[PDB]
Amino acid sequence: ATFEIVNRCSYTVWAAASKGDAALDAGGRQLNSGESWTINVEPGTNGGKIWARTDCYFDDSGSGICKTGDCGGLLRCKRFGRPPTTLAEFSLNQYGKDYIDISNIKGFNVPMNFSPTTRGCRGVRCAADIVGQCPAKLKAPGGGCNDACTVFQTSEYCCTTGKCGPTEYSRFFKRLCPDAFSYVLDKPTTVTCPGSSNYRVTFCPTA
């Protein structure tokens, strides 16, 4: 499957793509405002994620740091990034279907559209100004809006026991972005697409 990753933000983003234990394609790349990066994700990939990182500095070897979404200080991410990170999530070719979603379970840093470029399913979007409206206790100094599990580390926010309800923090994410997961047991906003579809992730889809 092919994914086009488009940075429509007015600021530079460092895109990342990983399945947790390995990079997807090159795993990461700088995207200036307007740049597009097309990657190939291998069929059958389970638990892939794509996200944006902000305010990064890297050297020759590709080591450095980002203020949101840092994946162990690497330009080419091998594992997942440090919250807050708006997440495009996908599992491909699972019994003939593809499954996609956007998640705020690890916080929010950049607005995002996640849409197929082929037929047979709708896209999902979280493009509200969650950073600007972020509750005081959830603002990340580096920018972005943390999830309550990251901040407070309780069984309720992290759904540690497998049983947990919506919270005043999760309701904040859900009210601004109904089409994204706001907590672990949220009523699923997953979209079912035909197997072997292709996709476009757009950062800052409206502004």
| Chain breaks of the chain after residues with C–N above 2.5 Å | none
Residue recorded with tokens 């997942």 = 80
Q: Are 8 and 31 in contact (CB under 8 A)?
A: no
Which is nearest to 5 in space by CA: 42, 48, 50? 50
Q: What is the 3-state secondary structure (H, E, C) of 111-175?
A: CEEEEECCCCCCCEEECCCHHHHCCHHHECCCCCECCHHHHHCCHHHHCCCCCCCCCHHHHHHHH
Q: Indicate which technique resolved this structure.
A: X-ray
Give the β-pairing of 36-40 and 2-7: antiparallel
Q: Give the residue among 123, 125, 127, 105 at the shortest CA–CA distance from 192.
A: 123
The Cα–Cα gap between 22 and 46 comes to 12
> What distance lies between CA 145 and its chain's CA centroid?
13
Q: Which of 68, 157, 72 is nearest to 112 (CA)?
A: 68
Are 180 and 106 in contact, with CB atoms under 8 Å apart? no
Give the position of tokens 């495009």: 88
Q: Distance (Å, rounded) from C-alpha 156 to C-alpha 165?
A: 7
Q: Identify the DSSP state of 108.
A: B
Residue spans of the domains in the chain: they are: 1-207
Q: Are 145 and 84 in contact (CB under 8 A)?
A: yes
Instruction: Name the resolution in angstroms.
Output: 2.2
- For residue 80, the tally of other CB atoms under 10 A from its CB is 20
Q: Are 41 and 3 in contact (CB under 8 A)?
A: yes
Lay out the sheet containing 199-203: strands in order across: 36-40, 2-7, 199-203, 112-116, 124-126
